[PDB]
């Protein structure tokens, strides 16, 4: 079935800048950002709509990956949509996990990174709270990692 | 005055592991990973209640520091309380910022990190959402960083 959840995160980083970091530079940041995400492979595409990325992450002695698909892009409105369609890193209980992201201006100088996750479980399979949360927590780690870089490199933003 | 905000963050890391990384290994971790914290100096104590640390961070090009004080520790219940009691890194509108944390076990095997921030102010002037949100984001950022560490370095936990 399908489950929809929304998540927000405030930031002192200006909208256009955070958006750029999150959707245009994040790929080229693997090297300069500590996190389980080891490498990001552009299987097919250069980043535009239709691009397929293989995202590898190492959790110690082990490793896994997810295959990402860039679904839609709207720079003007700071919009970015993609989804995980498979990969050893996608819980067995899920068929797919879509992300609809947008970055809006905050009320006091920064921005808000807004996300809407659409979980697709297998058939009538219910959605585990663990599975749901493991998903939200991973996106958050990623985000914090990108922001951290932006905040430490004003020269670049 | 005093303003209170509570929050709960779910994690896949087991409680004891998380508790240890956040309250025992954070100084070491903070200075190792790619992060704003440049150095941590002990001005008093070595970790026990009453301990005070001169934490020096860097966000952009501006350097700043805060004096952190250990207020209470209850390992029996994975509780840890500290507060920022001074320093240029503390917003001019705040007199002190205290944290009351606790890590509890989750139903799916993971854990839940509960945090309550208490913003202490000069007089009765209201707390700007800006100072409120940056303090929360920095707290959440630190959390995600420590957590990221634990996932990629199991040998220690």
**Nearest Cβ partner for A32 among B10, B34, B106:** B34
* Quoted resolution (Å): 2.2
Three-state secondary structure string covering B3-56: EEEEEEEEECCCHHHHHHHHHCCHHHHHHHCCCCEEEEEEEECCCCCCCEEEEE
Number of folded domains that form chain B? 1
Q: Range of A17's domain?
A: 1-157
Q: How far apart are the first and last CA of chain A?
A: 41
Q: Is B38 on the interface with A (CB under 8 A)?
A: no
Pairwise CA distance, residues A34 & A53, whole Å:
20
Phi, psi of A139 (to 5 degrees): -60, -40
Distance from CA of B134 to the nearest CA of A (A): 7
Q: Distance (Å, rounded) from C-alpha B50 to C-alpha A139?
A: 36
- Closest listed residue to residue B80, CA positions, set B71, B92, B93: B71
B88 at A interface, C-beta within 8 A? no
Question: In this structure, what CATH number is given to the domain that contains residue A35?
Answer: 3.30.530.20
On whether the CB atoms of residues A100 and A115 are closer than 8 A, the answer is yes
**Contact with chain B for residue A113, Cβ under 8 A:** no
Nearest CB among A58, A140, A151 relative to B152 is that of: A58
Q: Which residues of B touch A56 (CB under 8 A)?
A: none
Q: Looking at the complex, does the CB of residue A8 fall below 8 Å from at least one CB of chain B?
A: no
Q: Which chain B residues touch A89 with a CB distance below 8 Å? A: none
**Which residue matches tokens 């490199």?**
A153
- Asked if A148 and B34 come within 8 Å (Cβ–Cβ), the reply is yes
Residue A30's φ and ψ, nearest 5 degrees, are -35, -55
CB-based contact A119:A2 (threshold 8 Å): yes
Hey, are the CB atoms on B109 and A128 less than 8 Å from each other?
no
Question: Across the interface, do A154 and B106 touch by the CB < 8 Å criterion?
Answer: no
């Amino acid at each position: 079935g399908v489950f929809v959840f929304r998540d927000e995160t405030s930031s002192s980083v200006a909208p256009a800048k955070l958006y750029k970091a999150l959707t245009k530079d994040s790929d080229t940041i693997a090297q300069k950002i500590d996190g389980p995400i080891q490498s990001i492979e552009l299987v097919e595409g250069n980043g535009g709509v239709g691009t397929i990325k293989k995202i590898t992450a190492n959790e110690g002695d082990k490793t896994s990956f997810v295959l990402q698909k860039v679904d839609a892009i709207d720079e003007a409105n700071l919009g970015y949509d993609y989804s995980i369609v498979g990969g050893t890193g996608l819980p067995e209980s899920l068929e797919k996990l879509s992300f609809e992201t947008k970055v809006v201006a905050g009320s006091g100088g920064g921005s808000i990174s807004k996300v809407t996750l659409k979980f697709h479980t297998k058939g009538d399979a219910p959605l585990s709270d663990a599975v749901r949360d493991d998903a939200l927590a991973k996106g958050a780690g990623f985000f914090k990692a990108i922001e951290g870089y932006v905040l430490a490199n004003p020269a670049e933003y």
